């Protein structure tokens, strides 16, 4: 079971059978404890279990960019006599795509009671299986009626990718950047070109609307190039004008895509041209600077490939690394 | 100057429709197809020439000043799709019927009036005046044999037209009993030196030879350059360099303003970023980066490092022709001819060199520098004798073939290979297969498919029609025909050569 | 077309003598030290300015010091390793120019070969190299031992190390000996001493042992080295093959690989326009303006122009065209025989394109080799050529070309050259010169031209062997533009406050015919000048 | 809180500040009640609030294709004497990406007790807010003890985007095809190679596990080649041994990705060498044929670009159009 917050982060995760190949190993590791209800091993014993848990968390989560696991492993046994509520001392993270979790794997499941209860204003979740919950939340271990209950506790820090982000347009309305085209109209594209014998410009920023109109934003000289308002009808002619500004390359060839694929959209039809967005206010330049900074920050790990064909003798193929973001400009 | 003017004059007399064979091309159809081919060639080559088509001997007239039996089908204008279609209306038996319905095919005509109408056509053009010529398509060698008064007037009008500056060429077609030029012409047609006295074309019987003759006498030769051939620093003669072959490229699209359709210039400017303004040529420098090292040169120094010799051809020596390898090809050859307009006496020395080089079977090894500040290339001037076919068409011009020779840097290494020889039985089977697939090669036997498809699409669009029907490529082998010709020889060759396991 | 190579580097050790005897002067010839410096400079210049991945080491012998890892006391003395195996740079070129000085000692060159072998063996352990080469620049004027000789050879065959030798003199036999002396031109067995003869014998023995008779072709002189590409012969790479199937019909297929035999060499780098003061490209803006057809100075948007095609007197707009409509759908990469024809029908003046291809059978295919051999031999016997259709890939425009047999003692192949289409032929007419009374040369003029052609022959028949020898083979001469450009770039990089130097003398010498032809041609040229009037026009 | 099941389909949605702009109108509709335990009012006349909730659901739900609300509102009053489950909340959806929900909007909320309880055998939910829950779950209206609990019920049908497909393996078990990787062990890649002068093969197909091992399944001639069971250590080896017509491709160049990406797992961590799954039974072959057919069907609409680089001078680039499908297999 997956539980997400409003900002999009993942807070709770419920495991059905994910932790099964490690329960026997952890049980064997807990044989080496003498008279200790709650005992912490800061050794990890064999790091194979730590690596296994890291791989499992990598595979069965979403947008995981990194995983960090503490060496210490705690084991706690509960009696039908003692239980109490433990609040969390308002742990608040610093960066907006990072959260520290607590993971509980049951070594012995109580027959009755012994359910982890998590408190949130929207609702409370009472579970009796392996769990992973954010350290922000408040939790309690309910009393056990019959049987014993032994659990293992690990501290895991993970980093995410923030599929949707926010840009503060003004003091009243901030818009949302999405990685999917669904429902969006304007698309910003950060394009880089690898080494070639006919390319002299590396980085180009282009804003594309649903009608195919493209506007230049940045070409590594800053954002002031948006002041000239260079509006074109296709990315190929933009590349010819800017990236192929060589005198010999002007009247040389043309650029096209053999799969009829656009940079902004894959196979969606192009509507008739109606209007082209253009920064007219003053805060729009701050908007564009923030967008470019975020795109360049995430351009080293998130990108896709694009292919263009140049009609030369023989025709050549140009590969571009693209980072695409989708948004709607409120009117 | 710059726009050549060409007028196609086609006879409409009865005999132009007589075909001596049930399966043969009538002279009228031959002429129409030739004019259509000329139009298509002009459009493809993007040549901005003026062409006109006039029919004489018809029962209807359309000339400016009212004259009888002279119909001006098309005046002087650039070639286009509609004119080509109108010409296509007259092709074939149905086209002959259509022409004989729209116009006549038998009347009485006066050559003086026809040439007067053509001269008036030449006068009406106000754009440019250069290289006016009238080509006569006919198969009547005695047009006014029974009227001396008309013949004398025709001779006089031809003389005045020739003094004005208009060339007159004849394209006589096949006649029963042969065509006699000396009967009535040779008093009208233009003759320069001796090329139009004994080298005159024979009468045309097919479409290919007529087309070759038409394209030979209408295309003006343009010289790429007029260099100097220096035997040494003192003996220098003047020559012209020509490209008898040149790759045909698909014309790039042009930019047109939205207000109507107009060509727009493409200017280039240099801006110094924020400061702006046209940067001076002396305010820029040239740079090259090697590793982390920057090398700075001025533009003049960049030009100077490329400068070896003055432009021209400098003779280095004479080499036997057996020392020139066919597999040492580098770039397309050029043609070298004498030029008497710059240095007087060049033609005599050129002819003597050509004769002696042909006699001794030697090529002149020279150093070649086309323009200023260009590194030299070693070239071979191979002597080339004049060759004429049965129709007296010059298939090979006299002069020198400029063959580019590779440097050591242009020769690439081959990987090591073990020589595996074939037994005589396999070679004999291969010989049988080769002989079963023998054909005659001509330099003008294949057409570029991409160009033809592009221009067919353009013609269909300009006529406001739909996509044209695709045509079978002529550069694709006829696999079925080859398989039928080879028969079983392929199987036996495979049995001798290919092991059963692979 | 462009050259695509495998991507393997080479390790090259240059063994140079700097001893006492490699400094002697003579009134008309440079010392061997300067000639060796010129050859080494040319090699390193080409390596540096072409940005190759080959690694070069430099070992001097005959020096006043000892910096070699085999010294050990009273052994391998006066041998310095001036530069270890690494990528060449401008520091090495400066060292070759004005840092390395002639020595006052003498060293055995076999010990130098041992040191170079040690460098190759112990400096290539961590890296990958496809070729190991040693070039030895010596004059063979020093005493030498013969004990280690055999061991040397064994090592040179165990580690697969190639050798080239460069000497002040040539290896010609019965040359016959022969104004001012010119270096690097195309035109001395009694001028060498006994020690030089013994060294030459040992060099010949080593070269024959390593390769064979052809090994004798790997001993050069500095003068001929400066006008050839010999120093790059053992480190050059061939292109990646083009694989296809030669089809004769729809039932006979031969697996073939095509290589580029001739392809023009061009400058790899261009000049970048930079600002005069900042010397940066970012301070230059290149904007094009379509200023209508007059000086209206009306603002024009990028989308304002709609573009179109021309068909004579009419314009077809881009709004009525579709990308899928005007696209010649190629049938794919192919090599298909259209037919066979007499070799006399295909002439050289109709050759087109900018490449020549050599077609061999596919590697590790005995049946393909046998079939291609049969085809080549049949074509040669019948004196015929194959007109074929050639398509590089599914995007390249198909062409029609000629494949003709090429049989040699060591290999046999087909040669492909492009042929024209109808649209590429221009039918001009030229006046006949032989049938002209105005330009008919006299008998005396013809005799003068015959004498001129006789006196300016660049070939010579062998003595009762019917063999033609070329006295000016320009196909073995490198392009002077590359060496001139490299010289100018190095001079700018090392002397920023100096003008560019003039063209070197040996380039001019190698661009000119032998002086014998010029001497012979003087009198017939005078006769031709006095017999042919040539007056320039006075328009 | 977006409650997501293992299939990625939303089941429980709880709103707090979402229907505060509708409750007044809903109550205005409610007053037309005259002694009815559970009244039903068709909304064919008053369909405005239907459109308003439709807009809210479209705005606040993710990956939405169509929302089909019913034009009837059921008002139910709950008194301190009641206990109802109906004990028969069994209902199976006919399709894959479609679900029916019940929407409970609280009109008169009890002050102390009687919340709504939702059961599932991994956790239980108790809530007292605006709720929307699928019809596949058993629900309890807890016994209220003060005031009154007056609620309104809608009927909701939602169809989402097609990111889920089913393929029959045998009579008993079936296999799920997903467009994105999440806890999926196997990936099938259908590859179309862009035209290169060195490549003699157009289309191929591979199966890749997380270890990076590749098994060739189809070569545009069907699934016959999987009978040979050709297994390579990576995708570069598959290209070396499959798509080149010459003899020794490894002697000429080496193929690798310059961004350390994988054809199936992107920038992830391949596991250590492990056994690769191969078809043994005719059911496996039938499943493979079905999967290949489905992948070929969608190969023209959805695909991405992959780039391999050969270390030639200049470097060679090979472009692949890849269609990926991630799936699990039974033990």
UniProtKB/Swiss-Prot annotation, chains A, D:
| Name of this protein | Protein C10
InterPro entries for the chain: Poxvirus_C4/C10
Annotated Pfam families: Pox_C4_C10
Q: Which domain of life is it from?
A: Viruses
The UniProt family comment states: Belongs to the poxviridae C4/C10 protein family.
Using the chain's own numbering, where are the disulfide bonds?
Answer: none
Swiss-Prot record, chain B:
Mutagenesis / variant outcome for changing residue 132 to A:
Abolishes adduct formation
Give the Enzyme Commission number: 3.6.4.-, 4.2.99.-
Where are residues bearing Phosphoserine located in the sequence?
A: 19, 274, 445, 488
| Cellular location(s) | Nucleus; Chromosome; Cytoplasm
Keywords, ordered alphabetically: Acetylation, Activator, ADP-ribosylation, ATP-binding, Chromosome, Cytoplasm, DNA damage, DNA recombination, DNA repair, DNA-binding, Helicase, Host-virus interaction, Hydrolase, Immunity, Innate immunity, Isopeptide bond, Lyase, Methylation, Multifunctional enzyme, Nucleotide-binding, Nucleus, Phosphoprotein, Systemic lupus erythematosus, Transcription, Transcription regulation, Ubl conjugation
Q: Ku domain spans which residues? A: 229-436
Q: State the conditions that upregulate or repress this gene.
A: In osteoblasts, by FGF2.
Q: Does the keyword Transmembrane apply?
A: no
Identify residues that carry Phosphothreonine. 423
Q: Which residues carry this modification: N6-acetyllysine?
A: 285, 299, 306, 429
Q: Where is this region: Interaction with XRCC5?
A: 341-450
Spans annotated as DNA-binding: 245-309
Crosslinked positions (Glycyl lysine isopeptide (Lys-Gly) (interchain with G-Cter in SUMO2)): 255, 285
On modification after translation, the UniProt record reads: Phosphorylation by PRKDC may enhance helicase activity. Phosphorylation of Ser-19 does not affect DNA repair.
The highest taxon in the source lineage is Eukaryota
Annotated GO biological processes are:
activation of innate immune response; cellular hyperosmotic salinity response; cellular response to gamma radiation; cellular response to X-ray; double-strand break repair via classical nonhomologous end joining; double-strand break repair via nonhomologous end joining; innate immune response; negative regulation of DNA-templated transcription
Q: Name one GO cellular component term.
A: cytosol
Instruction: Please list the disulfide bridges.
Output: none
Q: Which GO terms describe its molecular function?
A: 5'-deoxyribose-5-phosphate lyase activity; ATP binding; ATP hydrolysis activity; ATP-dependent activity, acting on DNA; cyclin binding; damaged DNA binding; DNA binding; DNA helicase activity
Please report which protein family the annotation says this sequence is part of.
Belongs to the ku70 family.
More info: Individuals with systemic lupus erythematosus (SLE) and related disorders produce extremely large amounts of autoantibodies to XRCC5 and XRCC6. Existence of a major autoantigenic epitope or epitopes on the C-terminal 190 amino acids of XRCC6 containing the leucine repeat. The majority of autoantibodies to XRCC6 in most sera from patients with SLE seem to be reactive with this region.
In which organism is this protein found? Homo sapiens
Gene field? XRCC6
UniProtKB/Swiss-Prot annotation, chain C:
- Which positions carry N6-acetyllysine? 146, 260, 327
Region of interest (Leucine-zipper), residue spans = 140-167
User: What is the recorded post-translational modification?
Assistant: ADP-ribosylated by PARP3. Phosphorylated on serine residues. Phosphorylation by PRKDC may enhance helicase activity.
Q: Anything noted about its domains?
A: The EEXXXDDL motif is required for the interaction with catalytic subunit PRKDC and its recruitment to sites of DNA damage. The VWFA domain interacts with the KBM (Ku-binding motif) found in a number of DNA repair proteins.
> Quaternary structure?
Heterodimer composed of XRCC5/Ku80 and XRCC6/Ku70; heterodimerization stabilizes XRCC5 protein. Component of the core long-range non-homologous end joining (NHEJ) complex (also named DNA-PK complex) composed of PRKDC, LIG4, XRCC4, XRCC6/Ku70, XRCC5/Ku86 and NHEJ1/XLF. Additional component of the NHEJ complex includes PAXX. Following autophosphorylation, PRKDC dissociates from DNA, leading to formation of the short-range NHEJ complex, composed of LIG4, XRCC4, XRCC6/Ku70, XRCC5/Ku86 and NHEJ1/XLF.
Q: What is its biological role?
A: Single-stranded DNA-dependent ATP-dependent helicase that plays a key role in DNA non-homologous end joining (NHEJ) by recruiting DNA-PK to DNA. Required for double-strand break repair and V(D)J recombination. Also has a role in chromosome translocation. The DNA helicase II complex binds preferentially to fork-like ends of double-stranded DNA in a cell cycle-dependent manner. It works in the 3'-5' direction. During NHEJ, the XRCC5-XRRC6 dimer performs the recognition step: it recognizes and binds to the broken ends of the DNA and protects them from further resection.
| Protein name per Swiss-Prot or TrEMBL | X-ray repair cross-complementing protein 5
Q: Which organism is it from?
A: Homo sapiens (Human)
Which gene produces this protein? XRCC5
- Boundaries of the shown chain within the full protein: 1 to 544 of 732
């Amino acid at each position: 079971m997956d539980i997400y917050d409003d900002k999009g982060l993942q807070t709770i995760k419920l495991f059905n059978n994910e932790f099964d190949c490690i329960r026997n190993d952890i049980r064997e590791l807990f044989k080496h404890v003498t008279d200790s209800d709650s005992i912490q091993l800061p050794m990890e014993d064999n790091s194979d279990i730590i690596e296994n848990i890291r791989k499992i968390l990598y595979r069965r989560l979403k947008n995981v960019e990194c995983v960090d696991i503490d060496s210490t492993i705690t084991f706690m046994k509960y009696d039908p006599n003692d239980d109490n509520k433990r609040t969390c001392s308002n742990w608040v993270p610093l960066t907006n795509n990072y959260m520290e979790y607590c993971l509980v794997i049951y070594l012995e499941t109580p027959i009755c009671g012994g359910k982890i209860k998590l408190y949130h204003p929207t609702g409370n979740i009472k579970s009796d299986k392996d769990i992973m919950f954010a350290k922000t939340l408040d939790f309690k271990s309910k009393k056990v009626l019959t049987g014993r209950k032994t659990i293992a506790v690990l501290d895991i820090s993970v980093s995410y990718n923030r599929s949707m982000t926010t840009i503060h347009y003004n003091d009243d309305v901030d818009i949302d950047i999405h990685t999917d085209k669904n429902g969006k109209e304007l698309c910003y594209c950060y394009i880089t070109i690898d080494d070639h014998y006919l390319v002299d410009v590396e980085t180009i920023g282009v804003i594309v609307n649903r009608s195919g109109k493209c506007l230049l934003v940045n070409n590594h000289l800053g954002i002031g190039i948006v002041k000239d308002k260079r509006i074109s009808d296709s990315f190929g002619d933009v590349c010819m004008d800017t990236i192929f500004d060589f005198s010999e390359a002007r009247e040389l060839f043309s650029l096209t895509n053999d799969d009829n694929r656009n940079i902004a959209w894959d196979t969606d039809k192009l509507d008739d041209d109606t209007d082209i967005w253009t920064p007219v206010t003053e805060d729009d330049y701050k908007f564009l600077s923030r967008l470019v900074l975020y795109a360049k920050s995430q351009s080293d790990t998130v990108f896709d490939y694009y292919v263009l064909t140049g009609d030369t003798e023989p025709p050549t193929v140009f590969i571009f690394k693209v980072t695409r973001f989708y948004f709607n400009m409120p009117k | 100057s710059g726009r050549d003017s060409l007028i196609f004059l086609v006879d409409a007399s009865k005999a132009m429709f007589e075909s001596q064979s049930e399966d043969e091309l009538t002279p009228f159809d031959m002429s129409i197809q030739c004019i259509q081919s000329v139009y298509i060639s002009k459009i493809i080559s993007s040549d901005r020439d003026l062409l006109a088509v006039v029919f004489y001997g018809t029962e209807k007239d359309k000339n400016s000043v009212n004259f009888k039996n002279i119909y001006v089908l098309q005046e002087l204008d650039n070639p286009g799709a509609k004119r080509i279609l109108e010409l296509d209306q007259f092709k074939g038996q149905q086209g002959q019927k259509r022409f004989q319905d729209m116009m006549g095919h038998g009347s009485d005509y006066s050559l003086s009036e026809v040439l007067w109408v053509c001269a008036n056509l030449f006068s009406d053009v106000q754009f440019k005046m250069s290289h006016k010529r009238i080509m006569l398509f006919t198969n009547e060698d005695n047009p006014h044999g029974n009227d001396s008064a008309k013949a004398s007037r025709a001779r006089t009008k031809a003389g005045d037209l020739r003094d004005t500056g208009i060339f007159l060429d004849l394209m006589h077609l096949k006649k029963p009993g042969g065509f006699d030029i000396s009967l009535f012409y040779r008093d009208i047609i233009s003759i320069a030196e001796d090329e139009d006295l004994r080298v005159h074309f024979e009468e045309s019987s097919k479409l290919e030879d007529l087309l070759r003759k038409v394209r030979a006498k209408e295309t003006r030769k343009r010289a790429l350059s007029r260099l100097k051939l220096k035997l040494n620093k003192d003996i220098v003669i003047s020559v012209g360099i020509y490209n008898l072959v040149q790759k045909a490229l698909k014309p790039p699209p042009i930019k047109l303003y939205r207000e109507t359709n107009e060509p727009v210039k493409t200017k280039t400017r240099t801006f110094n970023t924020s400061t702006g303004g046209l940067l001076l040529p002396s305010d820029t420098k040239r740079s090259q980066i090697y590793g982390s090292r920057q090398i700075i040169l001025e533009k003049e120094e960049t030009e100077e490092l490329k400068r070896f010799d003055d432009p021209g051809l400098m003779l280095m020596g004479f080499k036997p022709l057996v020392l020139l390898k066919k597999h040492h090809y580098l770039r397309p050859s050029l043609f070298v001819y004498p030029e008497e307009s710059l240095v007087i006496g060049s033609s005599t020395l050129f002819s003597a060199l050509l004769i002696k080089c042909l006699e001794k079977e030697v090529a002149a090894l020279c150093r070649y520098t086309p323009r200023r500040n260009i590194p030299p290339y070693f070239v071979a001037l191979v002597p080339q004798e004049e060759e004429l076919d049965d129709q007296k068409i010059q298939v090979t011009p006299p002069g020198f073939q400029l063959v580019f020779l590779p440097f050591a840097d242009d020769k690439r290494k081959m990987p090591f290979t073990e020589k595996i020889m074939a037994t005589p039985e396999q070679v004999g089977k291969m010989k049988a297969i080769v002989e079963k697939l023998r054909f005659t090669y001509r330099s003008d036997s294949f057409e570029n498919p991409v160009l033809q498809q592009h221009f067919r699409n353009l013609e269909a669009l300009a006529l406001d029609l739909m996509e044209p029907e695709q045509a079978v490529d002529l550069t694709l082998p006829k696999v079925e025909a080859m398989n039928k010709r080879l028969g079983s020889l392929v199987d036996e060759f495979k049995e001798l050569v290919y092991p059963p396991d692979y | 077309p462009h050259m695509v190579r495998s991507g393997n580097k080479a390790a090259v050790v240059l063994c140079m003598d700097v001893g006492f005897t490699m400094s002697n002067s003579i009134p008309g010839i440079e010392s061997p030290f300067e000639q060796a410096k010129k050859v080494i400079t040319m090699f390193v210049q080409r390596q540096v300015f072409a940005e190759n991945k080959d690694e070069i080491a430099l070992v001097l012998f005959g020096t006043d010091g000892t910096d070699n890892p085999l010294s050990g006391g009273d052994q391998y003395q006066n041998i310095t390793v001036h530069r270890h195996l690494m990528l060449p740079d401008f520091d090495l070129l400066e060292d070759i120019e004005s840092k390395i000085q002639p020595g006052s000692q003498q060293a055995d060159f076999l010990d130098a070969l041992i040191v170079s072998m040690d460098v190759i063996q112990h400096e290539t352990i961590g890296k990958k190299f496809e070729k190991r080469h040693i070039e030895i620049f010596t004059d063979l004027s020093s005493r030498f031992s013969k004990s280690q000789l055999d061991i040397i050879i064994h090592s040179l065959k165990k580690c697969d190390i190639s050798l080239q030798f460069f000497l002040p003199f040539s290896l010609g036999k019965e040359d016959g000996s022969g104004g001012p002396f010119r270096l690097g031109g195309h035109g001395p067995l009694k001028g060498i001493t006994e020690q030089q003869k013994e060294g030459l014998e040992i060099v010949k023995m080593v070269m024959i042992s390593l390769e064979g008779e052809d090994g004798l072709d790997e001993i050069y002189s500095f003068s001929e080295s400066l006008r050839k590409l010999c120093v790059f012969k053992k480190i050059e790479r061939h292109s990646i093959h083009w694989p296809c199937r030669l089809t004769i019909g729809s039932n006979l297929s031969i697996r073939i690989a095509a290589y580029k035999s001739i392809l023009q060499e061009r400058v790899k780098k261009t000049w970048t326009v930079v600002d005069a003061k900042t010397l940066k490209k970012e301070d230059i803006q290149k904007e094009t303006v379509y200023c209508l057809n007059d000086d209206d100075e009306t603002e024009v948007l990028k989308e304002d122009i709609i573009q179109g095609f021309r068909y004579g007197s009419d314009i077809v707009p881009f709004s009525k065209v579709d990308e899928e409509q005007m696209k010649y759908k190629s049938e794919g990469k192919c090599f298909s025989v259209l037919g066979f024809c007499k070799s006399s029908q295909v002439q050289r003046r109709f050759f087109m394109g900018n490449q020549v291809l050599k077609v061999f059978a596919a590697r590790d295919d005995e049946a393909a080799a046998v079939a291609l051999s049969s085809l080549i031999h049949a074509l040669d016997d019948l004196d015929m050529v194959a007109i074929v259709r050639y398509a590089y890939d599914k995007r390249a425009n198909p062409q029609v070309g000629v494949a003709f047999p090429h049989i040699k003692h060591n290999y046999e192949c087909l040669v492909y050259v492009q042929l024209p289409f109808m649209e590429d032929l221009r039918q001009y007419m030229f006046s006949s010169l032989k049938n002209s009374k105005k330009y008919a040369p006299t008998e005396a003029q013809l005799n003068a031209v015959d004498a001129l052609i006789d006196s300016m022959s660049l070939a010579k028949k062998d003595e009762k062997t019917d063999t033609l020898e070329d006295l000016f083979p320009t196909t073995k001469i490198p392009n002077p533009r590359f060496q001139r450009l490299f010289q100018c770039l190095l001079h700018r990089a090392l002397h920023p406050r100096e003008p560019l130097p003039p063209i070197q003398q040996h380039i001019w010498n190698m661009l000119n015919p032998p002086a014998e032809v010029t001497t012979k041609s003087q009198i017939p040229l005078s006769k031709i000048k006095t017999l042919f009037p040539l007056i320039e026009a006075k328009k």
